[PDB]
Amino acid sequence: SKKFALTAEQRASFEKNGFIGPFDAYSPEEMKETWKRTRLRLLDRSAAAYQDLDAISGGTNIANYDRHLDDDFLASHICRPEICDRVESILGPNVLCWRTEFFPKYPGDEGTDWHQADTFANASGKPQIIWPENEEFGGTITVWTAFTDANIANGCLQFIPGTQNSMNYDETKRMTYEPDANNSVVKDGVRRGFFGYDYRQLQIDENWKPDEASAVPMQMKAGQFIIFWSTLMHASYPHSGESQEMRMGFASRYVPSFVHVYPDSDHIEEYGGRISLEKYGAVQVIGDETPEYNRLVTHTTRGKKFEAV
């Protein structure tokens, strides 16, 4: 009954395909203006949850994590009813935003590798989210918002429909780090990579390949968002550099509050080091009940409440 709830037909399509949308959070004009201001603000990490990131060596997107914990706009964004009423339709009455991540594609950048994520296992094989072990559910609902236009030419997302119910990768396997890939590694005809790593190295079967012939593009205008299971096969196109503007996506990740977030961990464990979770918490964006085993925050590190404005 909530204003932006998924219709029954949208809920059915989400169940079949593993994604639904795009939907509008902002007009393109509002998004363009907001991102202009926000991009400049984010250069200042003085209030960021994670400090001393220079101690983490090798490949890591950690600098793009969890800026909602310090930023005024992002703190509202993760709580937008346009997003949350739809996540509620899938995840129920009590839901946490446990992770956010920026995905820049600069002109010429490689496409994101085909991947699925279920446990979000850390460097030591330890899951960062755990669902009830007596049940068959896994992963997180990803809401990917286009902070810029997202088109094939600048590296929009792509999905293989209906692949969210079986994992092709083992997140406890180890990838090797390539500092000098130069966005140049061609994988079945497409430049792809994973932050210096190769997600193919996580495959359960080394000889298996994604059903890329069945991939579908997801072009989006600035201010739109797409909702998908992290367990769905997903990737992005390369940025051809035809446009000299970078593409920016912002992912917010949601789990029901009964899911254990960073269980038995006081750090994000990357290949190159540990990042303290001292100033981390999950944000309760829907409902008001969460079990005590999940650490919550109610405000950013600059005292801005997590609520939609």
Ligand X SMILES: CCCCCCCCCC(=O)OC[C@H]1O[C@@](CO)(O[C@H]2O[C@@H](OC)[C@@H](O)[C@H](O)[C@@H]2O)[C@@H](O)[C@@H]1O
Ligand Y SMILES: O=C(O)CCC(=O)C(=O)O
Chain contacts with ligand X (rule: CB under 6 A): 91-93, 136-139, 164-165, 229, 231, 256
- Residues 218-247 touching ligand Y, rule: CB under 6 A, are 230, 234, 236
19-24 and 224-229 as β-strands: parallel, antiparallel, unpaired? antiparallel
Nearest to 55 by CA among 304, 267, 288, 286: 267
Name the DSSP class of 197: B
β-pairing, 190-193 vs 111-112, is parallel
The pair of structure tokens assigned to 109 is 């950048």
Q: Which residue is nearest to ligand Y (CB)?
A: 103
Q: Residue 256 touches which of ligand X, ligand Y, none (CB < 5 to 8 A by kind)? A: ligand X
Among 107, 143, 145, residue whose Cα is nearest residue 238? 107
| Closer residue to ligand Y in complex, CB, 154/290 | 154
Q: In angstroms, give the least distance from the CB of 162 to ligand X.
A: 10
Q: Which is nearer to ligand Y, 86 or 290 (CB)?
A: 86
Nearest distance, CB of residue 215 and ligand Y, angstroms: 14
Interaction between residue 103 and ligand Y (CB under 6 A):
yes
* Cα gap 147→149, rounded to integer Å: 7
Does position 159 interact with ligand Y (CB under 6 A)? The reply is no
Q: What is the CA radius of gyration of the chain?
A: 18
Nearer Cβ to ligand X, position 141 or 157? Answer: 141
**192 forms part of the interface with ligand Y (CB under 6 A):** no
Q: Which of 115, 113, 114, 138 is nearest to 128 (CA)?
A: 138
Residues that bind ligand Y (CB under 6 A): 103, 112, 142, 144, 230, 234, 236, 249, 251
